[PDB]
Amino acid sequence: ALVFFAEDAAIIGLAV
Amino acid sequence: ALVFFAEDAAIIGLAV
Amino acid sequence: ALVFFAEDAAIIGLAV
Amino acid sequence: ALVFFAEDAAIIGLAV
Amino acid sequence: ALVFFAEDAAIIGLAV
Amino acid sequence: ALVFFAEDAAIIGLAV
Amino acid sequence: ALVFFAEDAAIIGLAV
Amino acid sequence: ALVFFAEDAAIIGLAV
Amino acid sequence: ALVFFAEDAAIIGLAV
Amino acid sequence: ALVFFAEDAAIIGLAV
Amino acid sequence: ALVFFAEDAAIIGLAV
Amino acid sequence: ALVFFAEDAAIIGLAV
Amino acid sequence: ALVFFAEDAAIIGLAV
Amino acid sequence: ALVFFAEDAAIIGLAV
Amino acid sequence: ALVFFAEDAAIIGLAV
Amino acid sequence: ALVFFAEDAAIIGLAV
Numbered sequence: 001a002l003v004f005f006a007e008d009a010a011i012i013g014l015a016v
Numbered sequence: 017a018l019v020f021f022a023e024d025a026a027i028i029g030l031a032v
Numbered sequence: 033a034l035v036f037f038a039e040d041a042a043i044i045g046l047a048v
Numbered sequence: 049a050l051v052f053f054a055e056d057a058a059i060i061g062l063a064v
Numbered sequence: 065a066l067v068f069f070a071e072d073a074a075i076i077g078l079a080v
Numbered sequence: 081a082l083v084f085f086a087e088d089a090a091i092i093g094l095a096v
Numbered sequence: 097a098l099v100f101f102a103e104d105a106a107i108i109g110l111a112v
Numbered sequence: 113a114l115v116f117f118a119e120d121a122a123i124i125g126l127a128v
Numbered sequence: 129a130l131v132f133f134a135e136d137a138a139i140i141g142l143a144v
Numbered sequence: 145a146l147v148f149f150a151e152d153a154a155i156i157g158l159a160v
Numbered sequence: 161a162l163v164f165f166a167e168d169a170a171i172i173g174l175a176v
Numbered sequence: 177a178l179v180f181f182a183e184d185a186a187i188i189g190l191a192v
Numbered sequence: 193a194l195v196f197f198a199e200d201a202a203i204i205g206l207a208v
Numbered sequence: 209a210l211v212f213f214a215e216d217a218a219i220i221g222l223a224v
Numbered sequence: 225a226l227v228f229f230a231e232d233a234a235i236i237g238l239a240v
Numbered sequence: 241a242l243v244f245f246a247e248d249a250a251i252i253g254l255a256v
């Protein structure tokens with residue numbers, strides 16, 4: 001899977 | 017200040 | 033600890 | 049960016 | 065060589 | 081909008 | 097009077 | 113502080 | 129390109 | 145040294 | 161004639 | 177103008 | 193008080 | 209003699 | 225590179 | 241007085 005990143009603070013991975 | 021990023025897991029800031 | 037100086041504006045201490 | 053200072057003579061800035 | 069400065073108080077040089 | 085300029089070093093824009 | 101400057105594009109004067 | 117510029121002629125700084 | 133500025137009055141850009 | 149200014153965006157100095 | 165600007169400190173005009 | 181520096185703690189500028 | 197700095201070699205403080 | 213420092217840009221020495 | 229010379233006071237090099 | 245010039249590095253004046 002791809003992992004995108006976003007600031008949520010902390011940087012988190014978002015899995016696709 | 018500058019904030020660098022590193023994978024420590026989770027991505028963290030490092031402040032200078 | 034050492035304190036280094038940098039312009040960040042204001043002159044700030046950076047502690048090591 | 050941070051500007052550090054060093055004697056090189058003359059005192060110069062070093063930009064980061 | 066470059067001379068950086070730090071408070072160690074007294075100011076000291078750090079040569080590179 | 082207008083953009084004014086100031087030295088902060090770097091020259092920055094201020095938007096109005 | 098003082099003349100300030102802004103980007104409006106062209107640079108214009110603003111009279112005070 | 114920020115430094116703005118104006119014609120007063122010669123250009124001068126205005127500190128804020 | 130770079131844009132230099134000159135008083136020609138009004139301020140104009142000169143592109144390089 | 146002289147410092148000239150140009151839009152490069154951001155306004156940068158050019159040292160001579 | 162054109163007037164260019166430079167920091168010489170004070171901001172000065174340079175006439176061409 | 178000249179800018180001198182002093183500890184006031186934090187380092188500050190003094191304009192002359 | 194203010195503390196100014198001078199090269200005397202070592203960097204020394206001057207207390208005002 | 210003492211050497212004080214000021215921003216004039218470049219950092220310059222002032223000798224006393 | 226070429227080094228040109230100018231009175232800036234003191235005589236300085238300018239590198240091209 | 242005459243001023244002669246020598247590379248000493250930097251170019252310096254020598255009074256006579």
Ligand SMILES: [Cl-]
Nearest residue numbers: 081082095096
């Ligand atoms: Cl707005």
Ligand SMILES: [Cl-]
Nearest residue numbers: 123124125170
């Ligand atoms: Cl003034």
Ligand SMILES: [Cl-]
Nearest residue numbers: 108109138139
């Ligand atoms: Cl106009």
Ligand SMILES: [Cl-]
Nearest residue numbers: 140141142143
């Ligand atoms: Cl043109």
Ligand SMILES: [Cl-]
Nearest residue numbers: 157158159160
């Ligand atoms: Cl430059």
Ligand SMILES: [Cl-]
Nearest residue numbers: 189190191192
């Ligand atoms: Cl003050």
Ligand SMILES: [Cl-]
Nearest residue numbers: 060061217218
């Ligand atoms: Cl410099």
Ligand SMILES: [Cl-]
Nearest residue numbers: 209210223224
């Ligand atoms: Cl003296």
Ligand code: NA
Nearest residue numbers: 103107131151
């Ligand atoms: Na502009």
Ligand code: NA
Nearest residue numbers: 145167168217
């Ligand atoms: Na200058």
Ligand code: NA
Nearest residue numbers: 230231235243
């Ligand atoms: Na001369």
